[PDB]
Write a protein that holds these residues in place. Structure first.
Motif, PDB file in Angstrom:
ATOM      1  N   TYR A  35       0.166  13.373 -13.379  1.00 48.04           N
ATOM      2  CA  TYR A  35      -0.483  12.045 -13.472  1.00 48.04           C
ATOM      3  C   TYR A  35      -1.896  12.074 -13.127  1.00 48.04           C
ATOM      4  O   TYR A  35      -2.299  13.175 -12.624  1.00 48.04           O
ATOM      5  N   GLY A  39       0.764  -1.381  -0.081  1.00 41.61           N
ATOM      6  CA  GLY A  39      -0.019  -0.039   0.080  1.00 41.61           C
ATOM      7  C   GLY A  39       0.756   1.475  -0.062  1.00 41.61           C
ATOM      8  O   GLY A  39       0.327   2.201  -0.500  1.00 41.61           O
ATOM      9  N   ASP A  55      10.308   1.403  -8.402  1.00 45.21           N
ATOM     10  CA  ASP A  55       9.487   1.715  -9.395  1.00 45.21           C
ATOM     11  C   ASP A  55       9.450   0.958 -10.868  1.00 45.21           C
ATOM     12  O   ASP A  55      10.102   1.850 -11.500  1.00 45.21           O
ATOM     13  N   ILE A  73      11.853   8.442  -5.946  1.00 43.99           N
ATOM     14  CA  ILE A  73      11.386   7.312  -6.628  1.00 43.99           C
ATOM     15  C   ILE A  73      12.522   6.899  -7.604  1.00 43.99           C
ATOM     16  O   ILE A  73      13.227   7.716  -8.173  1.00 43.99           O
ATOM     17  N   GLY A  95       5.093  -0.239  -8.447  1.00 38.35           N
ATOM     18  CA  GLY A  95       4.909   1.218  -8.161  1.00 38.35           C
ATOM     19  C   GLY A  95       3.152   1.170  -8.107  1.00 38.35           C
ATOM     20  O   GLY A  95       2.959   2.058  -8.016  1.00 38.35           O
ATOM     21  N   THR A  96       2.589  -0.040  -8.336  1.00 37.18           N
ATOM     22  CA  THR A  96       1.075   0.030  -8.404  1.00 37.18           C
ATOM     23  C   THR A  96       1.064  -1.060  -7.154  1.00 37.18           C
ATOM     24  O   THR A  96       1.556  -2.142  -7.056  1.00 37.18           O
ATOM     25  N   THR A  97      -0.173  -0.768  -6.243  1.00 46.78           N
ATOM     26  CA  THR A  97      -0.590  -1.789  -5.224  1.00 46.78           C
ATOM     27  C   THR A  97      -1.049  -2.933  -5.721  1.00 46.78           C
ATOM     28  O   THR A  97      -0.818  -3.996  -5.342  1.00 46.78           O
ATOM     29  N   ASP A 122       4.175  -3.878 -12.414  1.00 46.25           N
ATOM     30  CA  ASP A 122       4.490  -2.593 -11.909  1.00 46.25           C
ATOM     31  C   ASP A 122       4.716  -2.581 -10.558  1.00 46.25           C
ATOM     32  O   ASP A 122       3.418  -2.460  -9.749  1.00 46.25           O
TER      33      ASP A 122
HETATM   34  C1  LIG Z   1       1.236   3.846 -11.007  1.00 46.97           C
HETATM   35  N1  LIG Z   1       2.485   4.437 -10.680  1.00 46.97           N
HETATM   36  C2  LIG Z   1       3.711   4.175 -10.538  1.00 46.97           C
HETATM   37  N2  LIG Z   1       4.047   2.713 -11.063  1.00 46.97           N
HETATM   38  N3  LIG Z   1       4.773   4.941  -9.991  1.00 46.97           N
HETATM   39  C3  LIG Z   1       3.867   6.170  -9.621  1.00 46.97           C
HETATM   40  C4  LIG Z   1       4.368   7.392 -10.776  1.00 46.97           C
HETATM   41  C5  LIG Z   1       5.709   7.386 -10.924  1.00 46.97           C
HETATM   42  C6  LIG Z   1       6.291   8.650 -11.728  1.00 46.97           C
HETATM   43  C7  LIG Z   1       5.338   9.456 -12.138  1.00 46.97           C
HETATM   44  C8  LIG Z   1       3.897   9.476 -11.737  1.00 46.97           C
HETATM   45  C9  LIG Z   1       3.378   8.482 -10.971  1.00 46.97           C
HETATM   46  C10 LIG Z   1       3.948   6.517  -8.306  1.00 46.97           C
HETATM   47  C11 LIG Z   1       4.394   7.734  -7.531  1.00 46.97           C
HETATM   48  C12 LIG Z   1       4.378   7.743  -6.322  1.00 46.97           C
HETATM   49  C13 LIG Z   1       3.939   6.779  -5.394  1.00 46.97           C
HETATM   50  C14 LIG Z   1       3.537   5.735  -5.911  1.00 46.97           C
HETATM   51  C15 LIG Z   1       2.932   4.645  -5.153  1.00 46.97           C
HETATM   52  C16 LIG Z   1       1.974   4.538  -4.219  1.00 46.97           C
HETATM   53  C17 LIG Z   1       1.400   3.471  -3.295  1.00 46.97           C
HETATM   54  C18 LIG Z   1       2.081   2.502  -3.382  1.00 46.97           C
HETATM   55  N4  LIG Z   1       3.142   2.178  -4.336  1.00 46.97           N
HETATM   56  C19 LIG Z   1       3.581   3.292  -4.803  1.00 46.97           C
HETATM   57  C20 LIG Z   1       3.532   5.412  -7.300  1.00 46.97           C
HETATM   58  C21 LIG Z   1       2.281   5.775  -9.961  1.00 46.97           C
HETATM   59  O1  LIG Z   1       1.432   6.616 -10.087  1.00 46.97           O
END
Ligand SMILES: CN1C(=N)N[C@](c2ccccc2)(c2cccc(-c3cccnc3)c2)C1=O
Length: 390
Positions: free
Chosen positions: A75, A15, A36, A122, A234-236, A232
């Protein structure tokens, strides 16, 4: 295990994200950086923010180089903006190398930093095609491979605890491993099965069949990859295209029909709670995703349990109940195999061989009756037709 220095170098949770320690500048400035695979910029907080207790101070780095260019990254649910530059970067629990990399110094942001996440930046590990402002901004991993002898591959073991971790526990717990330049055999059991990277931008893959407890979802396979399917960290959630989500939720509801859950649960909004230790894992189905194999007309499958797709959350009343949120949600931008899926597997990002490997994770949460699985091969025809084209 041949990469002991990198084993257990991650912390975090699905999360809030999984992060690795990095240093930037001279003398080195330590920061915690979100891993990420869904973006391609190395971007760090470089100005005070309510949710950051530290940030990159360019004026204190003797090796800082200003690129004299701004970057604007809007975004879906927010944005970040900053100034481009380069500096010397290292990963303390990583390869023993220092590289000169691009750094986006974040000066302004909206709904980017998360309170209590413990990360300040990130690490975008995907390809230059999706780097911002454009593909001329070399991603960190490309720089690392070009400047050193580090092999063009990394692998991720994201470890979900299977229960809630409070603020103190999440800082003291091992969240997983990011192995830079290799595959560590202690992180998985059984065999590694590889799927081709369809195109080098996101880590794009092709899903060829979906089952819910062995029952074929029976959709045209193009639906599963509409408009793309990506891996990904970076996605939960496991995110599915609208129609696929609607078909999967109907099948998951039918399999778990002995218990009725409110609409808010299936919408991923509200938690469901059971008395401590009584979560009825067995009523929830396993989900299998079949992925295109490296051999013609051959596929393999990865199978996850409700222990991966039900995300542990602390009850609003901090009770002794075991509570979860449904971690499968709809997407209008294709399938996203997020952290809750990655938590079941050791994932090898074999950039050198344009392929992604999956093996059962040594740290996946399961019960005495079922385990996650990575199995094959299966005869699958016309898999090239499963990919979407605009
Ligand atoms: C879907 N996704 C991602 N894979 N990285 C994020 C992102 C990265 C660069 C530019 C815009 C968005 C991101 C950013 C910040 C936090 C998170 C994030 C939030 C919650 C859990 N895990 C990761 C993801 C995002 O929105």
């Amino acid at each position: 295990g041949s990469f002991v220095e990198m084993v257990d170098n991650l912390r975090g949770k699905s999360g809030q994200g999984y992060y690795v320690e990095m240093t930037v500048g001279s003398p080195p400035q330590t920061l915690n950086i979100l891993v990420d695979t869904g973006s391609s910029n190395f971007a760090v907080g470089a100005a005070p923010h309510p949710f950051l207790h530290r940030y990159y101070q360019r004026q204190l780095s003797s090796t800082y180089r200003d690129l004299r260019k701004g970057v604007y990254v809007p975004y879906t649910q927010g944005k970040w903006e900053g100034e481009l530059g380069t500096d010397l970067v290292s990963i303390p629990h990583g390869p023993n190398v220092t590289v000169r990399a691009n750094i986006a110094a974040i000066t302004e942001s909206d709904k980017f930093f998360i309170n209590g996440s413990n990360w300040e930046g990130i690490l975008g590990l995907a390809y230059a095609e999706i780097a911002r402002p454009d593909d001329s901004l070399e991603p960190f991993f490309d720089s690392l491979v070009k400047q050193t002898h580090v092999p063009n591959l990394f692998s991720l073991q994201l470890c979900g605890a299977g229960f809630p971790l409070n603020q103190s526990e999440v800082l003291a717990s091992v969240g997983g491993s990011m192995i830079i330049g290799g595959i560590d055999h202690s992180l998985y059991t059984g065999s590694l099965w590889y799927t081709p990277i369809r195109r080098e931008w996101y880590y794009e893959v092709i899903i060829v069949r979906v089952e819910i407890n062995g029952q074929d979802l029976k959709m045209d396979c193009k639906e599963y990859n509409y408009d793309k399917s990506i891996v990904d960290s970076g996605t939960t959630n496991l995110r599915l295209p609208k129609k696929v989500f609607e078909a999967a939720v109907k099948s998951i509801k039918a399999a778990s029909s002995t218990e009725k859950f409110p609409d808010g649960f299936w919408l991923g909004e509200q938690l469901v709670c059971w008395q401590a230790g009584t979560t009825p894992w067995n009523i929830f189905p396993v989900i299998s995703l079949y992925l295109m194999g490296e051999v013609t007309n051959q596929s393999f499958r990865i199978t996850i349990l409700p222990q991966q797709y039900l995300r542990p959350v602390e009850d609003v009343a901090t009770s002794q109940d075991d509570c979860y949120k449904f971690a499968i949600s709809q997407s209008s931008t294709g399938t996203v195999m997020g952290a809750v899926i990655m938590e079941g597997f050791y994932v090898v990002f074999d950039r050198a061989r344009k392929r992604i490997g999956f093996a059962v994770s040594a740290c996946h949460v399961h019960d005495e009756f079922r385990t996650a699985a990575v199995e094959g091969p299966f005869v699958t025809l016309d898999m090239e037709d499963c990919g979407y084209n605009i």
